């Protein structure tokens, strides 16, 4: 009725602070894993060159 309740009350602020940091840590890691991915596609000039060769030019 008295003792355990008081010590639970004492624990609340630190646990709240640590869990807020843990949540921020998760969000930070989520952002850090994001990285714009640029793709490379076959240049059309080689297509235009193969087109020309096929013509027997």
């Amino acid at each position: 009725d008295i003792m355990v309740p008081s010590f639970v009350y004492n624990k609340l602020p630190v646990i709240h602070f640590l869990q807020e940091k843990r949540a921020e840590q998760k969000l930070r890691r989520v952002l850090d894993e994001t990285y714009t991915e640029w793709t490379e596609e076959l240049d059309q000039a080689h297509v235009t060159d193969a087109i020309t060769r096929s013509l027997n030019i």
Partner: protein, 53 residues
């Protein structure tokens, strides 16, 4: 250009009357004319519906 009617393919900026005088032998000049006249008579275009698909 297609609406106007000009050749679809690129055309170089050449003056073949000068090239004939420059070169001694006609064979390379005639070959160049054949290549460019064939190039200017072809449409270097592909279907960018099928390509995108």
């Amino acid at each position: 250009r297609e609406e106007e009617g000009l050749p679809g393919g690129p055309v170089p900026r050449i003056n073949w009357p000068q090239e004939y005088s420059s070169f001694i032998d006609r064979e390379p000049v005639v070959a160049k004319r054949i290549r460019y006249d064939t190039l200017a008579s072809t449409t270097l275009e592909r279907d960018e519906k099928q390509i995108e698909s």
